Design a binder for these strands. Sequence first.
RNA 1: AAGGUAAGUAU
Lengths: 28, 501, 22, 36, 320, 50, 99, 56, 141, 106, 56
Amino acid sequence: PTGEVLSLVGKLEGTRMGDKAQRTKPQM
Amino acid sequence: NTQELLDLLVKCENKIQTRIKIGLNSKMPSRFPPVVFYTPKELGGLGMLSMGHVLIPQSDLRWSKQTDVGITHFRSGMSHEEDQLIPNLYRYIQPWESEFIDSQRVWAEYALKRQEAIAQNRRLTLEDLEDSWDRGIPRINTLFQKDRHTLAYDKGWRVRTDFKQYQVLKQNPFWWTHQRHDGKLWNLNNYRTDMIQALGGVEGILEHTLFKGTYFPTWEGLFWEKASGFEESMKWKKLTNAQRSGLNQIPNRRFTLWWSPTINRANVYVGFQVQLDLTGIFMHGKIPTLKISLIQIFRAHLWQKIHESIVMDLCQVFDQELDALEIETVQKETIHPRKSYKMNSSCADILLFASYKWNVSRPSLLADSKDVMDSTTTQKYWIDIQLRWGDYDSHDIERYARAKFLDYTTDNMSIYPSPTGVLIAIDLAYNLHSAYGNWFPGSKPLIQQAMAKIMKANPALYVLRERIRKGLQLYSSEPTEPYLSSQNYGELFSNQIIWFV
Amino acid sequence: NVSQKRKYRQYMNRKGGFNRPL
Amino acid sequence: EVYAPGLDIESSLKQLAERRTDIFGVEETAIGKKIG
Amino acid sequence: SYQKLLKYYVLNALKHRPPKAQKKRYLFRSFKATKFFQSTKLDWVEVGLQVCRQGYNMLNLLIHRKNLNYLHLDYNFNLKPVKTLTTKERKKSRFGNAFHLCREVLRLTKLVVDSHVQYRLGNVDAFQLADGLQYIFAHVGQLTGMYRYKYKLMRQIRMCKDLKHLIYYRFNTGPVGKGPGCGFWAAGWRVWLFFMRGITPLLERWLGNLLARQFQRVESHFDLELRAAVMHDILDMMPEGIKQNKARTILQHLSEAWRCWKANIPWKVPGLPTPIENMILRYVKAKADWWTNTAHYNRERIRRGATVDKTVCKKNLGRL
Amino acid sequence: KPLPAPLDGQRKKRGGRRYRKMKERLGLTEIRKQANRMSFGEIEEDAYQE
Amino acid sequence: FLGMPAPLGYVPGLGRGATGFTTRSDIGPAKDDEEADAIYAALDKRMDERRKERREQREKEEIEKYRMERPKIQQQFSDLKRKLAEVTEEEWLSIPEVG
Amino acid sequence: LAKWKTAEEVAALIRSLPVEEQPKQIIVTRKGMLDPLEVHLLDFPNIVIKGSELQL
Amino acid sequence: SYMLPHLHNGWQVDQAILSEEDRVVVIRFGHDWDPTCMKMDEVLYSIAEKVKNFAVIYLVDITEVPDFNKMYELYDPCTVMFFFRNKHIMIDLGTGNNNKINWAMEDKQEMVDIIETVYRGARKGRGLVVSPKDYSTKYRY
Amino acid sequence: EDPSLLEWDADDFRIFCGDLGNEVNDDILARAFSRFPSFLKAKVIRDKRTGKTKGYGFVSFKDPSDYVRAMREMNGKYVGSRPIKLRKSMWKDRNLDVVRKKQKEK
Amino acid sequence: FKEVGIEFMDLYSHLVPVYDVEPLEKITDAYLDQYLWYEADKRRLFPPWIKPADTE
RNA sequence: AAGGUAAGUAU
């Protein structure tokens, strides 16, 4: 598995784009 | 959507990964572990953000901890699910239609808030608006920025940014929008945490990065020198072309030494094993950067020096407590100079002859507690120190101690004056002490404490740790100055010299 | 509690014997 | 000077023309042909 | 297996035209007529053991030709170091891939001959002899692993498996057991004979090379040809028997003229003779035509997708 | 114009005040102020903030 | 020291005092024998003569066809070098050495 | 600018004084000016600079 | 156009290499009529003017001087042996044969850097020296 | 403890030659280095038994002008293998050491 | 004006021009362009339908 | 097949 990065086409249906995309919070 | 785009990006990502690999060594790694290519530069790695899906093997997801009580082992990726895989880029990228919808909604909310606050006899709240933070295609996160009045003067900067390609000689990938003008639309903060924790956590990542080779527990607060003094000297001296290349090839050597364990494994880089000129470090495949870094670290017979230091410390410790141990003679044989880094301990390190008799139990490891001294009765005893350099997969000191004791004790080539004794082992890269075999009555806790104390502040070991810290440019975490002076005021006379201006 | 000076072997540049002296 | 004198340059050019018959000699026999 | 072997057969059938209008020069007959060799009659097994001994002598000389004892080839045609070879000694004792092929083929013929020898000297019966022949012919890939010695040989061995695949399938079609008892070695024997016939020219050529005592340039080639030809023409016109130094300085103007063309700036040297100026103009026009041609050709190669080097890319960018 | 021969660097025989004045005038005093040290822990900036 | 004669009676390899750069075995070579070499060369020539004539004729025809499409480098200015000698002796004598 | 020039003079006073006589701890309540003094203190690695909570 | 000095006789090259002082003697073995060797000779000519102070290039013909063909195993075109300080230097550039450069350099600046590194290593007295640019890969992609 | 050095004290302009090969340094090498007509000194520190020089020698000349000339004349160029280094001889005798110890007060 | 240098960046499919101008001329032209853009935006001198717009 | 000879020093 570590030999090379697998193509995304195989696991394309795994999830959606931005599945765990969370907005940021203000500082101070 | 575009399958061809995914295929081409994965192909060129593998191209760059192979370029890095061939930069490391001429051959091609059999396994090519992905910890190096995805550890963030803060933790000392390339930190390549990738849109692919590579499943990190569970064999490389384990880590150890050499606690005083015992050597504990953990596995971050032990969950009964799909093997841990580095998350891809799109997993934390907002969909464009979602971006537009969120922009419309948040701008409508901001307009409503401004209309409401107009009657509030004050400016906008700018605090309840934090519920709409980091949203909107326009820089709503920067809608409260100070430079907005300065930024409001500029009109139509998009065309200027586009023509910057004809203005600036370097390509500008971010020509869609200008930084600090349309705001940081993409929030990439959770990606770093997800990548570091999915690689096996901070400790799991550092387990293969020679971090355990430094006695200081600099898990946090450590300083990594991106640029060293040699960089300043090269910049000032106006170096030539070859000198410039040599100065630029410094950070590569730096992190390749920093990644020595996971890059010098046995499964990775299969082929003929080879050790250095006068040390006990085995390297698989010629890696010029690692070779030169190792011969710098182990310069001037450092392996023989640390072996002599540890044997002298053991002799002094045994001589100091010779009363309870009934030690009549505690000496060392005429060890051949090359027998320090030799694969097999043909010559015994320390010999100890008691007065009349000495009861020894069956061989075991230091973690054991039970003992039956009636197993054997001998008048002599032997102690052997094994200086070993643990890799990312061969760092199991206890298993190595057991195997080495079994092999050396039961061998024709090895010559031990006494059949009863204990062999000690020190993993330099792991900085882990262990022992295996028989014990003197009541000396097992004594030997454990002696090994811990010596490995804590051994002179040659401390010098080697300092050499590692300097070579890897990992400066020791800076101490905190006693900014307080209430105790200093009372102890002002105690200070030898002090002044204030 | 005292510690007598610690001696060491001069393996380098020693033509007296092939093996280190004890 | 570092470069050879004119006579040496002429001799070298004559040798190159005699050996390499692709662009020299009566006929183009071979690259390493002694006689073109 | 059937589909793959049919593919091999149809590819063999496609390209079939002999231009070989030979003179019927029987080299083997000439070697027979040579005084250095003689003729006799002997058993086939004796000839096989003679060839095995000759091949062992061949490999022995080829190995210990430089008085190196690091590598030793056993009587079973397996090379093995006499000790833990040093890295410098390992580099010293290295042989090419075709030597790997030669050792493998010698191993194959030696093992076949020895199998017939042990058959003749009682031991195992002839049915198992045929079965072992079949297996060896169809398992050379496993037995010798020619893969590394030569990639193409993989094709032969893989098809041999295919033919064997059919052979065993038919042999064990009915009442015959599904065991290893199959004896149709000819099918793979002919394929190995054909592949050996194809290979042997290479081994013969390399062995002759050893037995004897002599054991990016296209654009650069054309530029060197242009400059050398112009220099030779000048030295023909310019009397080197009288003037020597100035001829070298002539080359300077050449370069000057060339850069005068590259900068697209006027170039006029009244001191130089008019015929010399005409020759320079012809040289520079030819060089400019070739230079533009190769520039656009390399640009097309780069933009198409062909792999290029950094220096080549920089030069092409400068020319463009 | 041949390139100079890269002879091995020879340090100053005696550090002089005028030599120190040149060192005061030209050197890496400002670069030394900017520390290149990087914390082992992650920084607040993004992965490719640059 | 270009342009100097080589004093005979000394082996250049041994006199200089060099070490054999043994890069790799089987890469370098490292009267009855003469007669055998001649016989084997004759046998090799006899074997090679099976196809020499037709191959040589085809190669000559191909080379002749190639020459028509593009001749040798000196062919494009054969007329120029024919007229090159028409320059006076004093012409190239005063060639400006400066560039 | 005055603070930068004062740092040079501050190090000059330590340079003139003997290392033993030089203050082992330079306790200055000016934390903002302590850092240039600490930067100036880098010229003397043996000496140390500690923040002064107490202000003279 | 191959105007660099050439060793007509084999022994002349030997004494020319022997007659060296604080300079590197780049003896380029091969034949001028070869096209790759012609490119290598052109590159050496381009370098010669810039580094003539310490780097001297002195070509030779294998046919003219075959006695040295077997000495250092001269059986390839474009071979270059940095025989400096009367000592055959060990120039390592990610290749199996780390004492012979047997192909024309792609760029002149790379050759200049290589030769100045060789000069530095020879002056330091070491018999071996590495290259800042490894040639195990041609960077084709 | 060095009576020979006292005999060598006649020539004031003494230079310290360093980076000498054990076999490279020799009397003939010093003679080749004796460019100036003034008498030289080929003495170099060496092992008592094996004679292996430590790489340090001293060359004494009676002409300080020749000293200055040779300071830059033979810096980095030497006939043998190991390149030569030249340094101003800071050599001191026991009397000078005692005087310096006495004057160290101020 | 002075001589503005012209270099080319190779996008591996074509050559894109980059132009280095005199720094004084560069800053004057930058101020000129900014003033023109502000005055055009303040007077709607450019219709909305032009695709490159800072709004989106 | 390989792309994995440390150099140095006199024997």
